A = this chain, B = another copy of it.
Amino acid sequence: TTALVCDNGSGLVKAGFAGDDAPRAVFPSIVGRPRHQGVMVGMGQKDSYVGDEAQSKRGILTLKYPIEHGIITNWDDMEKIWHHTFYNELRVAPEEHPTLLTEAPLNPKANREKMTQIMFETFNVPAMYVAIQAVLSLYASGRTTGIVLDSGDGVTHNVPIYEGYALPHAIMRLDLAGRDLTDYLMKILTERGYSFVTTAEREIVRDIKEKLCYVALDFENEMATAASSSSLEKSYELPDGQVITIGNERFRCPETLFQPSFIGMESAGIHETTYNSIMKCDIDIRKDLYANNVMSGGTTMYPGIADRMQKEITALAPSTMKIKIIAPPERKYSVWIGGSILASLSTFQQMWITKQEYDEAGPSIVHRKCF
């Protein structure tokens, strides 16, 4: 029977079947619960809402993310999300479908242990596997060597792979992603008089960030241009009909990716993280890591980030080297595409973790069979 590929990110869930080109079900990973007083009896009122139903009714709901910084904090809500993506969205029975799941590098065991235990004793599958998202992003690119930067909603990580061999000592993880940018835009939108304090308007600020923000090639020149004339200002329409206008905040929000000290973090930018991941490898592969910078995730979808990354890496690298950033138009779903490519391979069918080996070894085989 067809295998299931489910990418469980911190903000979005992308589930579908192996062998397909696009994920069938893409929905936000939120659980909404009522916060006001119900006065009308009956009419099918539910105590919880999952996915697009929580987003459509978000004016009377408190929204919670079960995953924070790539780590599942609430397990009942995560089970609700998995039940919704198995029975309501994909409309399949999980007892007859192997499931491929994704996970961020440098994570604790207990996330993967409880993931395997929930997938084998609650939504009991014939087989399961946990894969690294950067290896799938390199699978979707069609190449073998390269350094992958995957930035999503909680985790931004750099993983270099040369000729199918990964270097785990150069894998870097940074807890700066799109939710931090949404919080920073929430903070700096009060600088013009716009107040967004609750969880429902966090989605509005996230929509503003998705539609109107961009990465500047030169930061100081863009701030000088924004201070000189009002040519970079853009208008947005609120759901209640109000119109807001933003200026430099279109490029100050993603600049925290390159300058984390805007939100008080001591770490370096993503360009310096990529460069330090390259020079922590062997020297004879660094050239092949310079021409194969693969970018994946929804956070890498700003329309100025590839040229800016090429500029900073060329400023850091020696001048005799070719820097080439790979930014495909479908890099928002490249982890799922790589998972669908990997699950359809004939050489992958011996690497599943079946139910018999789970019963024989306990929930600890997942660290000796996966990476």
For A342, what are the chain B residues with a Cβ–Cβ distance below 8 Å? 41
User: Known: A193-B71, A318-B241. Is A166-B39 also a contact (CB below 8 A)?
Assistant: yes
**Contact indicator B42/A345 (Cβ below 8 Å):** yes
- A264 lies within 8 A of B36 (CB): yes
Question: Which listed residue (B35, B169, B197, B284) contacts A175, Cβ 8 A?
Answer: B197
The CA-CA distance from A204 to B58 in the complex, in Å, is 38
CA distance A284 to B60 in the complex (A): 9
Which residues in window 153-181 of A have CB below 8 A to B?
161-170, 173-175
- On chain A, the number of residues with a Cβ less than 8 Å from chain B's Cβ atoms is 84
Q: Please choose the segment from A5-13, A84-92, A102-110 that sits at the chain B interface, where 4 or more of its residues have CB less than 8 A away.
A: A102-110
In the bound complex, do residue A165 and residue B39 qualify as a contact, i.e. CB atoms below 8 Å apart?
yes
- In the complex, whether A83 has a CB less than 8 A from a CB of chain B is no
A217 CB to nearest B CB, Å:
24
Q: Is the CB of A283 within 8 A of B187?
A: no
Does A118 touch B at the CB level, under 8 Å?
no
Contact call A187/B106, Cβ cutoff below 8 A: yes
Which of A16-24, A232-240, A302-310 lies on the face that meets chain B?
Answer: A232-240
Q: Which of B60, B62, B138, B195 contacts A285 (CB 8 A)?
A: B60
B199:A41 contact, CB within 8 angstroms = no
Chain B: CB-nearest residue to A227: B364
| Nearest CB on B from A328, distance (A) | 19
Residues of B within 8 A of A106 (CB): 187, 190-191
A237→B320 CA distance, assembly (Å): 9
Contact call B192/A62, Cβ cutoff below 8 A: no
Whether A261 is near chain B, meaning CB under 8 Å from some CB there, is: yes
Mark each residue of chain A from 211 to 241: 1 if its CB lies under 8 Å from any CB of chain B, else 0.
0000000000000000000000000011111
A38 in contact with B347 (CB, 8 Å): no
| Contact status of A191 and B108, CB under 8 A, knowing A164-B43, A266-B198, A348-B41 | yes
Cα A36 to Cα B163 in complex, Å, equals: 11
Asked if A287 is an interface residue, CB under 8 A from chain B, the answer is: yes
In angstroms, how far is the closest chain B Cβ from the Cβ of A51? 16
Chain A residues proximal to chain B, CB less than 8 Å:
34-43, 45, 57-60, 62, 71, 106-110, 132, 135, 138-139, 144, 161-170, 173-175, 187, 190-193, 195, 197-201, 204, 237-243, 261, 263-267, 279, 281-287, 317-321, 342, 345, 347-348, 351, 371
Can you list 5 A-B contacts (CB < 8 A)? A36-B168, A58-B284, A71-B193, A240-B321, A241-B320
